[PDB]
Design a protein around this ligand. Structure first.
Ligand SMILES: Nc1ccn([C@H]2C[C@H](O)[C@@H](COP(=O)(O)OP(=O)(O)OP(=O)(O)O)O2)c(=O)n1
Ligand SMILES: [Ca+2]
Ligand SMILES: [Ca+2]
Ligand SMILES: [Ca+2]
Ligand SMILES: [Ca+2]
Ligand SMILES: [Ca+2]
Length: 901
DNA sequence: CGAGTAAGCAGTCCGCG
DNA sequence: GCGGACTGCTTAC
């Protein structure tokens, strides 16, 4: 096999590399890598090295990396550009792996671990590590084993061994329900004392040294805790055995309001799963506890126990250990679903970076572009200092708030990357500038043509047309990967819909799910067999289809995020290729494109309808248009349609055969107007939306910018078995909105769009009547909580104190003195409830950590004093009044003359 | 900690004769 | 009471 790196580090004048050799074995090596850097040189000096602008460079070969670094410093002191890859390990990878890397994930040791630490005096601070580590479960991907290290004797209690037999039994048998599929994969090791547990752990770790190290909050808790506890017991040298090169660094993570410490283990790639999830999931959750995320992703129930965690080991060590093992398995289950580890490896090996660098799009793109340029003997510029400056972004159309019955939406495929490629925007392709006219003048095609030579953006920038820039070249490569995966995602989605249809008629038989590739549209043969399958088999297929879709979603959306990140990286001062001219070339062209095509679409439809001055485009944001199709439907007449799917087809056909060619001609003209390199503005139909045929549903509504809802029948070519709501921006979509309120507001919207005013009034009346029975957590608002100290004045609210922060201060007073009550963590999320006038808490709200039950110390009082009236008005009635007045609808029945009867 | 900007709503403070 | 100036948070793209 071809060799691939596992990890790479610079330590002084050495590169330390762990790698898989040509025989599939793991090796480590120290290499005295001699880096090269570059300086500009005279034209008369023969070279093969050129900077990205075609200026000649001399290569400087250094005796060692320290010399290269010292040279960089002296080049600053002189005031001359020191060119080349200053991150020498990236240059090492580029030299050592001068090919497209094919990696074999079965050779990569992926470790998932979780530790337990009993603490009577509150949260066990990792930087102190003053309490014994009493459980470690460490799953190894190569062995496919859960290694359990269980402490039986502690200052906080002596316990009996954990029992695999009880662990396996049902909760209803008094067991822990550790999933049977992992029971045989558990290797249980009890220890008499913590010293021997830790010593054995380190020996195990040497034998099976993680390459990828993950788990839940491992970087902020488990790793620094284990490191510091071993440091405190045995000394630093022993603790540094967690690094295969025996090198570690305390790393200080700073943000706006404070800083925290992590432990960098040289020669390991830590990908904390909580951070993978935050970057890659495209969710915003009310809580990031593993219990909360597991329930959301996997539909598994919360891990249940009596009393606080601080007493669980002594009261129920059996459950304590089982829940430790289950917690490690839950992260593996999430990854089997989301496949974020697979994604990180793909992207990291593609870019040729330390895998953990996938968290930084700047670092990822710096390496991709470096490797691209190096291939052609080109030399990258030195990174420079830039002051942070604001710059303009997208255009968003102000919609007229209203109901909108029939809507067809369109938007650009990979808008910003397509702009980059079309215009040929790149550091080295800048050809110059032209005199800019007001944007409105380009939008209406009255401005002078910018250039007859170069490819232009309406911000004044001109680019070469003879050759593709490195940015368009590299962005195109990832875009193409994105498109392949999106194809698989969309096929799986359509396949899912076929299964749902077939579920309306399940067969009474015993059979199997069909062995199929859900990434490809089902053939007629498969479709036939599906119509003969049982509900059990169908549901299993649907589950598999949806997992396939999830896998496709992860691969496509995060590749989309990568290329979109390049567009934004051009507007970050830390990026090697920061340039506001290019960042704004993209965004300004985007604004033109939208408004240009709005004008074209209006012109086209006014034409087909024999009208003048009518607005058919009702809204748009960045790269999208929403087109009113009422007039198109009305031209055939609702009476001519057999059912909803009939007019959906008709609109689908109209969009495909009339709208899209019209849209395409409009953009081709714009491309010529701007003299662009290649026409790449492809604005495909997204959604077809309307009420069910013959209903009183209103179909859709807008309340304002970034606030709308649509009843959609077909999304990007997926024809749904049941209509699906596309809701954007509204309260149903905000993690801040109480869970039960999100649900009620969604059902209010479904009724509005699908059934009409009377159905909405019927539901509202019931919700208003019954909501006081809703569980307190389900009706609590949610907020991130920053600057709790800033607004704390003797435990009371200082001036301008935010409502949620006030709730926390109330909580803090109510639990004061308790070393045991859960603390609110600065920067994390809280539930918030309003309190009735004259409550014992002495303020108008209380807040506590989200994803948790409020401590029993105060729970009864909170429940008794919860202000349901304020809660209802603020979270439910106010947003609903906003939806209904926008939609010209009443959520309560108004009096009429009929009431005389 | 980790690419970008646009823009919505909640809440505080306070004006508005 | 409502809105503007401002802070805080959250979402659409
Ligand atoms: N998370 C996001 C979403 C969008 N955008 C910017 C870049 C996108 O290109 C543009 C349009 O947003 P879309 O959500 O429509 O994304 P794309 O057009 O890139 O992809 P798709 O092909 O799925 O429409 O807005 C961004 O910077 N970051
Ligand atoms: Ca735990
Ligand atoms: Ca788009
Ligand atoms: Ca599309
Ligand atoms: Ca059937
Ligand atoms: Ca869009």
């Amino acid at each position: 096999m071809k060799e691939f790196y596992l990890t790479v580090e610079q330590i002084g004048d050495s590169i330390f590399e762990r790698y898989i050799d040509s025989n599939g074995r793991e090796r480590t090596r120290e290499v005295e890598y001699k880096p090269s850097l570059f300086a500009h040189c005279p034209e008369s000096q023969a070279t093969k090295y050129f900077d990205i602008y075609g200026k000649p460079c001399t290569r400087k070969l250094f005796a060692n990396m320290r010399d290269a670094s010292q040279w960089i410093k002296r080049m600053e002191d002189i005031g001359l550009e020191a060119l080349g890859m200053d991150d020498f390990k990236l240059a090492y990878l580029s030299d050592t792996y001068n090919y497209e890397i094919k990696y074999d994930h079965t050779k990569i040791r992926v470790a998932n671990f979780d530790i337990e630490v009993t603490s009577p005096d509150g949260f066990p601070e990792p930087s102190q590590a003053k309490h014994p580590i009493d459980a470690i479960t460490h799953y190894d991907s190569i062995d496919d084993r859960f290694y359990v290290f269980d402490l039986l004797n502690s200052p906080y209690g002596n316990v009996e061994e954990w029992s695999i037999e009880i662990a396996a039994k049902l909760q209803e048998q008094g067991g822990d329900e550790v999933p049977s599929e992992i029971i045989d994969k558990i290797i249980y090791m009890p220890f008499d004392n913590e010293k021997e547990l830790l010593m054995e752990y380190l020996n195990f770790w040497q034998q099976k040294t993680p390459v990828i190290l993950t788990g839940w909050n491992v970087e902020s808790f488990a790793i620094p805790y284990v490191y510091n506890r071993i440091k405190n017991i045995f000394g630093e040298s022993t603790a540094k055995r967690l690094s295969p090169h025996r090198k570690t660094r305390v790393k200080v993570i700073e943000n706006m309001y404070g800083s925290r410490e992590i432990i960098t283990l040289f020669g390991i790639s830590v990908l904390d799963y909580i951070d993978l999830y935050k970057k890659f999931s495209f969710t915003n959750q009310p809580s990031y506890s593993l219990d909360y995320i597991s329930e959301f992703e996997l539909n598994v129930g919360k891990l249940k126990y009596d009393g606080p965690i601080s007493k669980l080991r002594e009261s129920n060590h059996q459950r304590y250990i089982s829940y430790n093992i289950i917690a490690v398995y839950r992260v593996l289950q999430i990854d089997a679903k989301r496949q974020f580890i697979n994604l990180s490896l793909d992207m990291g090996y593609y870019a040729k970076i330390q895998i953990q660098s996938v968290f930084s799009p700047i670092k990822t793109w710096d390496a991709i572009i470096f490797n691209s340029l190096k291939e052609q003997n080109k030399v990258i510029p030195q990174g420079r200092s830039h002051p942070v400056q604001p710059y303009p972004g997208a255009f968003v159309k102000e919609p007229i708030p209203n109901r909108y019955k029939y809507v067809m939406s369109f938007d650009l495929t990979s808008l910003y990357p397509s702009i980059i490629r079309q215009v040929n925007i790149s550091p080295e392709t800048i050809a110059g500038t032209f005199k800019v006219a007001p944007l409105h003048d380009y939008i209406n095609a009255v401005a002078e043509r910018p250039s007859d030579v170069y490819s232009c953006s309406p911000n004044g920038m001109m680019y070469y047309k003879d050759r593709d820039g490195v940015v368009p070249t590299e962005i195109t490569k990832v875009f193409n990967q994105r498109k392949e995966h999106k194809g698989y995602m969309l096929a799986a989605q359509r396949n899912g819909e076929i299964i749902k249809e077939a579920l309306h008629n399940p067969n009474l038989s015993v059979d199997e799910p069909l062995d199929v590739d859900y990434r490809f549209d089902f053939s007629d043969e498969i479709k036939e067999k599906i119509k003969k399958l049982s509900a059990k088999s169908l549901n299993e297929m649907l589950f598999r289809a949806q997992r396939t879709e999830v896998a496709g979603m992860t691969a496509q959306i995060n590749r989309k995020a990568l290329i979109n990140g390049l567009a934004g990286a051009l507007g970050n001062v830390w990026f090697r290729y920061y340039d506001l001219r290019n960042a704004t070339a993209i965004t300004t062209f985007g604004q033109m494109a939208l408004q240009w095509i709005e004008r074209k679409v209006n012109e086209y439809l006014n034409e087909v309808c024999g009208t003048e001055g009518e607005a058919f485009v009702l809204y748009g944001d960045t790269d999208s248009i929403y087109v009113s199709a009422d007039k198109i439907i009305d031209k055939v007449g609702e009476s001519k349609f057999r059912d909803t799917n009939h007019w959906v087809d008709f609109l689908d056909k109209f969009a495909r055969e009339r709208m899209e060619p019209a849209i395409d001609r409009g953009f081709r003209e714009m491309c010529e107007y701007m003299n662009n390199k290649q026409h790449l503005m492809f604005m495909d139909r997204e959604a077809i939306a309307g009420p069910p045929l013959g209903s009183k549903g209103i179909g859709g509504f807008w309340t304002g910018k970034k606030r709308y809802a649509l009843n959609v029948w077909d999304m990007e070519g997926t024809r749904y078995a049941e209509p699906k709501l596309k809701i954007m921006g509204l309260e149903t979509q905000k993690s801040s909105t109480p869970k039960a309120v999100q649900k009620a507001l969604k059902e209010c919207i479904r009724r509005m769009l699908q059934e009409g005013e009377e159905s909405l009034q019927e539901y509202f009346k019931e919700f208003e009547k019954e909501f006081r029975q809703l569980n307190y957590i389900s009706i609590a608002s949610v907020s991130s909580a920053n600057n709790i100290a800033k607004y704390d004045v003797g435990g009371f609210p200082g001036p301008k104190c935010p409502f949620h922060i006030r709730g926390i201060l109330t909580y803090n007073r109510a639990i004061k003195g308790n070393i045991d009550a859960p603390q609110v963590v600065e920067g994390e999320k809280v539930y918030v409830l309003p309190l009735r006038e004259g409550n014992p808490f002495g303020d108008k709200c209380i807040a506590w950590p989200s994803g948790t039950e409020i401590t029993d110390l105060i729970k009864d009082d909170v429940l008794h004093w919860m202000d349901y009236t304020v809660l209802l008005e603020k979270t439910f009635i106010k947003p609903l009044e906003g939806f209904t007045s926008a939609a010209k609808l009443d959520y309560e029945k108004k009096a009429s003359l009929f009431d005389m009867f």
